[model samples]
Target: KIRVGLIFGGKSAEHEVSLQSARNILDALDPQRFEPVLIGIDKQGQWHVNDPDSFLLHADDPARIALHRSGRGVALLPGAQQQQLRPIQALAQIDVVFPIVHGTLGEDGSLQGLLRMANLPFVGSGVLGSAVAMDKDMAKRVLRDARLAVAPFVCFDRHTAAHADVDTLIAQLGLPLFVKPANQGSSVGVSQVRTADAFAAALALALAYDHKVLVEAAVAGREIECAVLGNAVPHASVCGEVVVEIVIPADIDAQTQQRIQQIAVQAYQALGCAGMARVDVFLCADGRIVINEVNTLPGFTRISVYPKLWQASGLDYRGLITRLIELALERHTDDQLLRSAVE
Candidate 1:
């Protein structure tokens, strides 16, 4: 059986959310082929080998969700061509890692880099893809450079010391713009500014979290998020609408769905994503598909957008996890083909 080094828990604020998704993924791992090796990280960046039977302290309460202290500390260090889990004692190699951590250090390339050093097969995008995709400004820049449409936005940094002219930016992007930290994963440090008065506060809020900030024009068009998976030939799932209340199988024409899926794969590839990513598109009325952003690893609970979109596209939670692991193993083989040493 494949010992999947299932990494979950985090110092991130989305720890509870990650925990929820971790549980769903745990239940879905196929018993015949894969056995999970729970590596629960606490709020202090400590990884503990947890009891899969009852690792989650309180399954019902989000705030109360925590690692059950039963598992001892373990360190995954890279040596030779494989990763060693140095627990209180030496443990066997974990075949592949199914990293279910979030956008903070987890999804933002840090964990992926660690996994790469460990020489382990891991699910989802690599370090480059994860890093660029996590940065909203960088993601948009890559998309635009790839000739893909993205919502108009301006980027400025704290280094230049308030270099962005408020009046000029407003004139450029128009009203009802969004202010966000360039590297923020979720809605934290994000604000919708309608009036010029609100722009200052929103910018301040975003800049507080990150040195660089993004001021983007709000798209009035419907925003559609599509799920993509695979290595060389990527595939996209059906579209879903995220307007406060998410509607599954967004009520759009088939042509629109086809187009959105088409652009989703393009954005996914532009960012050099492998394994999987949730590519979003803003459907402008003028037939302009504004590639909103790419989430290398979106929410993974039973009903999260990532899994639910796949569900709407004919994949169940169990099957999705299985295919993702397979993709990870397949990607590992392809990665080995690259020349590691300089001649």
Candidate 2:
């Protein structure tokens, strides 16, 4: 059995969301195939070894069980063996890591880089992909530079935004603009400003979540999302559109569906995303498609669009989890063949 170091709960604003994801993943993992070594990171950024049963007990409300509630704290120690993680706690070795940490330091390449240094294969994108995709401004720049259509927006830090020309920005993007933190997930700090009066409050709300803020023109159309999975030759799942907070298989023309799938795969590859990602886009009424930001570590909750889209594509939740772990191992094995030093 693979000893999967299941790391969840983080210092991010989405900490509770991470806990919910971990609970779902733990229940879905095949016990005979995976022996989960639960590791939880509290809001204080402390790591601890947790009991899976205790974790699920508070699954109804993850915030109720703090990281201190777990057993003795642990730290990951780097070693030569790729399949084993040397934790200071002296527990069983972890063969691989599945990080369900969302937002900020967890998803924006920090945790991915740490796992890389520990020589551990992890589920999700690597450092570059995570960093690029996590920051909305950077993701938009890359997507636009790659000749992909993206909504026009302005990026500014909290300091500049405080004194900057808000009127000019509103004039440029117009009403019904979206204010979002550049590096957040699960729409933690996203607000829709329907009138000029709400722009300041929306920007302030977004700035509270991140130093950098993205003020973007709200694309007028349906919110369509496509799931891309794999390494080198990635595959795009059937398109799914979000309607009133629920996602279902998109009801669009075959041509639009095919075009959207192509764009999603292209964007995924352009960002060098491995394992999986959910590419969000807007299909305007004028037949124009505008690419939105990519989600590197999309939510795995029961109602998350990522898994739901795949489920609609015939890949169930359990099967999707298994495929991700397998992809991690496959990518790691292929990477092992490269020379580490001057030969």
Candidate 3:
């Protein structure tokens, strides 16, 4: 059986979310095809092999679970010949890593880079794709450069807030814009500003979460999303609509659906995303499909858009997870064929 190290509970604000995701993923992994090794990263950045039973005792309340020294302290050792997850007192092996850690250090390429150094295969985008997608400003710029339609916005650092041109930005972008931490996910530090009075508070809130902040013009329309899969030949799943807070397969004409799928695949390729990505877009009232953002390691909870979108497209949770693992293995095998040194 293929041993899969399921890592979760990271040092991000989304740590609880990660734990919740891990709980569901553990239940869905097929026993016949894979063996799951539960690994947890505590708030202080410590890694531990957790007890599955104790970890899920409070699965509904994710904040109740955390990585403790009582569990096996583990470290990832990188070598040219092999990549191993070494316990402080024993030896263990992982054929692949499925990282469910959601934000910051976990999703912003840090974990991916570490895995790459260890020469271990992982489920999700590589370092470049993760890094680019994690930064909202950079992703927007790259997408726009690729001829994608992106809403107008400005990015600034918290350190320069004292000298920031709030008036100019507000005038240029107009009112009713979104203030967000450029690198955060799940809308952790995001705010909708409809007036000038709320702008300062929103900026302060975003700055508290990240040094870099993004002020974006809110596109008025339906929120649409498409799940893209594969490496060289990507496929876009059926389109989905997110209205208010509910998500369902989009009810649109075939032409519009085809166009959205095409754009999503284009954006996915532009970002160099491998394995999978949830491409979020906006369908304006005027029938324009505007790119919102791309999420490389999106949430996989039962209610999360990533998996839900695929489920609507006919792939169940177990089947989707299996496909992701297979994709990771396939990508790794292809990459291994490349020469590491000049011959």
Candidate 4:
């Protein structure tokens, strides 16, 4: 069995959300070929190996509540050449890391950077990709630099009062924009601003969650999501549309869907996201599909958009999960091969 060290629960506003994602991944992992390791990081940033048999916390507590309430402090030490996951006391081995972790320390390149230092293989984007994907403002800039069409957005530093220059941005981008924390996911700290009056509070709220905030003009169209998999040669899943019409509420036509799938593939490749990623898009009312944002470590909850899109495209949840592990192994081997040679 391949030892899979699953890391989750991070030091961010999305901590609770990460725990839920971790539970889903742990439950879905196939035991026949995978030996799962539950490494939980508390909101306080304490990492713990959740002992299934000795799990603490009252049975009455919600899963996340209990998870957040308990955990032995743990951390991974890199730069040891072996880059093994030694307990805080310093002990043991880890073959590969599958971080179900989202946001901050997990989703951002911070954790990936550590993994790189230890010469270990972990799932999801690398240092640069993770760092870029986690930063919305930066991601948009990179995509734009690549000549990819993205939703119109204005950026601001969270440290500065959003109201300081709110009118200036609003005049350029107009109202009814989406205010979001540049570095958060799971739709957390996302607000739909419809007017000038809504800007200050929403912008402030998003800024509170991240060091940077992104204000995107409303995309008057259906919300479409595309899932991409693999490493260098990533493949796009069948296009899936999120419609909110009279009956459906929204609709993403086949053509638009296909376009989004292609874009998702390109975005993944452009961002160097390996293992897996999901790109969300807005098929605007003007007949244009605007890139929303790319998620490196997207929500994998049982009913989340990422796996669901893949599932709808013919890959079941368990199958998708297995494929990700397989890809992780592929990446691990490839990295080792590259590291073996000194440039």
Best by lDDT: 1
RMSD of 3: 2.1
Instruction: Tell me the whole-model lDDT of each prediction, alpha carbons only.
Output: 0.85, 0.83, 0.83, 0.74
> Predictions ranked by TM-score, top down?
1, 3, 2, 4
The superposed Cα distance between candidate 1 and the true structure at residue 53, in angstroms, equals 1.0
TM, every model: 0.95, 0.91, 0.92, 0.86
Residue 159's lDDT within candidate 1 is 70
Steric overlap count per candidate: 0, 0, 0, 8
Q: How accurate is candidate 3 locally (lDDT)?
A: 0.83
Cα lDDT of model 1 by residue, 93-164, tens digit:
799899988647997899998888778889999999999999889999999999998889988788753666
Poorest lDDT segment (10 consecutive residues) of candidate 4 = 243-252
Better model by lDDT, 3 or 4?
3
lDDT of 2 at 253: 86
User: Counting only residues 3 or more apart in sequence or on different chains, how many pairs clash (N, Cα, C under 3 Å) in candidate 3?
Assistant: 0
Off by over 4 Å in 1: 339-343
RMSD in Å for all candidates: 1.6, 2.4, 2.1, 3.3
lDDT for model 1, on a 0 to 1 scale? 0.85
Task: Give the Å error, residue 46, model 2.
Answer: 1.6
